Assembly symmetry: C4
Homo-oligomer: 26 residues x 4
């Protein structure tokens, strides 16, 4: 429940790092 | 409740896939 | 506590919509 | 706990400001 929200957060954050890599390339 | 939180989380996530895909569409066409 | 997390979520989501507008322009 | 959640939320937020600012830096130089 609280872990579940944190878990999803962690995934969200990984996407943001992947969006930064897409930007570093372009 | 957690219902709204869970829906916001999925919507956040989906918007993130969308952005990633816009960025990817852009590098191709460049 | 649960509102607080939701509140922050809502802000996060507004940024994502603003990032979409920045992309629609460029 | 909520401590970790709150730190992840701030970090999410900060990364979002950063991205917005990279996008804004890019449109100027274009």
């Amino acid at each position: 429940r609280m872990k579940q929200i944190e878990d999803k957060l962690e995934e969200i954050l990984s996407k943001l790092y992947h969006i930064e890599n897409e930007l570093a390339r372009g």
